[PDB]
Amino acid sequence: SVIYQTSLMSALLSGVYEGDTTIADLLAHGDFGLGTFNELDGEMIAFSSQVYQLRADGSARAAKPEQKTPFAVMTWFQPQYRKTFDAPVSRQQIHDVIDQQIPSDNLFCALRIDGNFRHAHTRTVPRQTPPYRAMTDVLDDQPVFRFNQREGVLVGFRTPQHMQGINVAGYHEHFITDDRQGGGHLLDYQLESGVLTFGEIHKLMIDLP
Amino acid sequence: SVIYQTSLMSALLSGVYEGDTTIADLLAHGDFGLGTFNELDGEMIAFSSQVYQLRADGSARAAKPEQKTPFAVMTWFQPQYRKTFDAPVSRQQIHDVIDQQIPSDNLFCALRIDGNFRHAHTRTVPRQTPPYRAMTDVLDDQPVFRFNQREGVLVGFRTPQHMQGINVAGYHEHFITDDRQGGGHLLDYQLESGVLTFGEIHKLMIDLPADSAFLQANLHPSNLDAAIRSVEN
Ligand SMILES: [Cl-]
Ligand SMILES: [Cl-]
Ligand SMILES: [Zn+2]
Ligand SMILES: [Zn+2]
């Protein structure tokens, strides 16, 4: 049970938008994860060994193995816990449940939700052309996508505070709809109903750029 | 070709001085490295899959496979570069040489020197008793040993600056004498003559402990870099 990542989140935010790790490589390190693609071309989400690309123009595609990534986090998902939510529940309330069960911040968590989302807000980063700006300074218009009563899959990690530059500290969740056509990096959501699985991980492996 | 480490420098700093990783475990992840031992009992140096414990009372001994460590760094040493020195050369100049060859700071380096050290100072951390205090708050004297015109072995890593809590950022080097009876954690040194070998590494593997002291520790203290620098230099 091992968190694998390609490159550093510090390195990404710095404008290092290309890397030589392939989707082929990713799937050798996990069946489960998230990240982005070279040239910052969309959001990556992965589960059950399926890897999807979520792009600005709302389109979506299964990823090609040869496609490359400048940042991704993978594991072999092995949840320890199941929660059934039969009434609406906020993203933060979800996190309160997991935080209460796995209170140490010095571990990783991985978590999946299958369910109906009452509300979901994503961003999906647009493809960038060189020379690369810092991500906080993407001059390109990038909208907040909104989903209401949409069935979908959520994939996420909770990363220790003290690893802020290495990975995304705290909760980092990606989302894709049932039809596998929309989603992205989640900014907030409310679950109408669904099934949560999660667990702790305490091994970290980094391929450096 | 992988940097293996058990726990984090962060954790050791905060006072988590007991781990469950054994020396035998370490040796399954490399033939080369450095660290400390449970209860902060001294310095560990490892090379040619030989492991030594340098203690605060000046004793040196082969480590036992079943001894535990709260923090250690290992790899299978596969140097790509080699430079010999026939004239003296400072610790910084050594680092300058490696930096010229491996300028990327996204990479780790492992380095070994075999030779005659004109000068060296080493520290060895003193064994602690619970309740453990943080390293910036240790009450015991921390002995410094001096070596002049001594043959020996230097083992070291270069860690990317942006990984300062995970590991010891920058250069971290340990030392033992030819007769394996003195050394420890290097503070300064000057090589009289000898042979440098080193190489680049771009994979890092961290085992996080699951014991209670580790799980409760604060690993993002205020001025992390300054704190670690006050302890490692
Ligand atoms: Cl992302
Ligand atoms: Cl050390
Ligand atoms: Zn994201
Ligand atoms: Zn040391």
DSSP A156-186: EEEE-GGGTTTS-SEEEEEEEETTSS-EEEE
Q: In a mutagenesis test of the B interface, which of A6, A167, A201, A206 is the best target, namely the one with the most B β-carbons within 10 Å? A: A206
Q: What is the DSSP letter of A56?
A: T
- On chain B, the residues whose CB falls within 8 A of the CB of A20 are none
Distance from CA of B168 to the nearest CA of A (A): 14
Cβ burial of B113 (10 Å; 0-12, 13-18, 19+) is buried
Tell me, letter by letter, the H, E, C secondary structure of B64-77.
CCCCEECCEEEECC
Distance in angstroms (rounded) separating the CA atoms of residues A117 and B142: 58
* B positions 2-41 inside 8 Å of A (CB): 8, 10-11
Co-location of A86 and A41 in the same domain: no
- On chain A, the residues whose CB falls within 8 A of the CB of B217 are 106
Cα within 13 Å of Cα(B34), Cβ side: 26
Distance from CA of A202 to the nearest CA of B (A): 5
Co-location of B54 and B121 in the same domain: no
Distance in angstroms (rounded) separating the CA atoms of residues B128 and B13: 13
The range of the structural domain enclosing residue B166 comes to 78-200
Distance in angstroms (rounded) separating the CA atoms of residues B116 and A145: 65
CATH code of the domain in which B131 resides? 3.30.1330.80
Co-location of B39 and B142 in the same domain: no
Give Cβ neighbours of residue B66 (< 8 Å, ≥ 6 apart).
Answer: B22, B23, B24
Distance in angstroms (rounded) separating the CA atoms of residues B158 and B102: 10
Backbone phi and psi for residue A40, each to the nearest 5 degrees, phi listed first: 60, 30
Q: What angle do CA B28, B30, B33 make, to 5 degrees?
A: 130
End-to-end CA distance of chain A: 23
Which 3 state secondary structure label does DSSP give A92? Answer: helix
Question: For the stretch A5-39, what's the b/e string if a residue is b when 16 or more beta carbons lie within 10 angstroms of its beta carbon?
Answer: bbbbbbbbeebbbbbebbbebbbebbbbbbbbbbb
Nearest Cα to Cα of residue A26 among A54, A41, A7: A7
* B positions 125-164 inside 8 Å of A (CB): 160, 162-163
Co-location of B191 and B159 in the same domain: yes
Distance in angstroms (rounded) separating the CA atoms of residues A16 and A22: 16
Compute the distance from residue A43 Cα to the ligand 3 centre, in Å.
7
What's chain B's length in residues? 233
Q: What residues are paired with B204 via a beta bridge?
A: A206, B3
Q: DSSP for chain B? A: --EEEES-HHHHHHT-----EEHHHHHTS-SEEEEE-GGG-SEEEEETTEEEEE-TTS-EEEPPTT-EESSEEEE-----EEEEESS-EEHHHHHHHHHHH---TTSEEEEEEEEEEEEEEEE-PPP--SSP--GGG--S---EEEEEEEEEEEEEEEE-GGGTTTS--EEEEEEEETTSSSEEEEEEEEEEEEEEEEEEE-EEEEEPP-SHHHHH---S-TTHHHHHHHHH-
**B66 in reach of chain A (CB within 8 A):** no
Query: Which position has the token pair 């984090």?
Result: B8
Q: Say if CB A113 and CB A47 are below 8 A apart.
A: no
Nearest Cα to Cα of residue A34 among A125, A101, A97: A125
Q: DSSP for B142-167? A: --EEEEEEEEEEEEEEEE-GGGTTTS
End-to-end CA distance of chain B: 28
Q: What residues are paired with A82 via a beta bridge?
A: A197
Distance in angstroms (rounded) separating the CA atoms of residues A163 and A170: 9
Co-location of A181 and A117 in the same domain: yes
Distance in angstroms (rounded) separating the CA atoms of residues B104 and B65: 35
Distance in angstroms (rounded) separating the CA atoms of residues B233 and B221: 19
Co-location of A157 and A110 in the same domain: yes
Resolution in A: 2.4
Backbone phi and psi for residue A35, each to the nearest 5 degrees, phi listed first: 155, -145
Q: What residues are paired with B43 via a beta bridge?
A: B36, B54
What is the distance of C-alpha B101 from the center of its chain? 22
Co-location of A49 and A106 in the same domain: no
Q: In a mutagenesis test of the B interface, which of A20, A80, A106 is the best target, namely the one with the most B β-carbons within 10 Å? A: A106
Co-location of A188 and A118 in the same domain: yes
To the nearest 10°, report the CA torsion of A38, A204, A13, B159.
Answer: -110
Query: Which position has the token pair 């050798």?
Result: A28
Co-location of A87 and A54 in the same domain: no
Cβ burial of B87 (10 Å; 0-12, 13-18, 19+) is exposed
Indicate the number of domains in chain B: 2
Q: Do B219 and A165 touch (CB under 8 A)?
A: no
Q: How many CB atoms lie within 10 A of CB B121?
A: 15
Compute CA distances A151 → A9, A48, A177, whole Å: 30, 17, 6
Q: In a mutagenesis test of the A interface, which of B12, B21, B105, B106 is the best target, namely the one with the most A β-carbons within 10 Å? A: B106
Cβ burial of B45 (10 Å; 0-12, 13-18, 19+) is buried
Co-location of A54 and A87 in the same domain: no
Distance in angstroms (rounded) separating the CA atoms of residues B75 and A145: 46
Compute the distance from residue A50 Cα to the ligand 4 centre, in Å.
43
Backbone phi and psi for residue A115, each to the nearest 5 degrees, phi listed first: 175, -170
Co-location of A4 and A93 in the same domain: no
Question: For the stretch A54-78, what's the b/e string if a residue is b when 16 or more beta carbons lie within 10 angstroms of its beta carbon?
Answer: bbbeeebeebeeebbbbbbbbbebe
Q: Using CB atoms, pick whichever of A165, A166, A203 lies closest to residue B208.
A: A203
- On chain A, the residues whose CB falls within 8 A of the CB of B206 are 203-205
Distance in angstroms (rounded) separating the CA atoms of residues B216 and B73: 22
Q: Say if CB A148 and CB A25 are below 8 A apart.
A: no
**A209 in reach of chain B (CB within 8 A):** yes
Distance in angstroms (rounded) separating the CA atoms of residues B78 and B200: 9
Nearest Cα to Cα of residue B216 among A97, A31, A160: A160
Co-location of A180 and A158 in the same domain: yes
Distance in angstroms (rounded) separating the CA atoms of residues B5 and B9: 10
Backbone phi and psi for residue A167, each to the nearest 5 degrees, phi listed first: -135, -170
Distance in angstroms (rounded) separating the CA atoms of residues A21 and A109: 23
Q: Say if CB B55 and CB B124 are below 8 A apart.
A: yes
Give Cβ neighbours of residue A193 (< 8 Å, ≥ 6 apart).
Answer: A85, A86, A87, A88, A115, A116
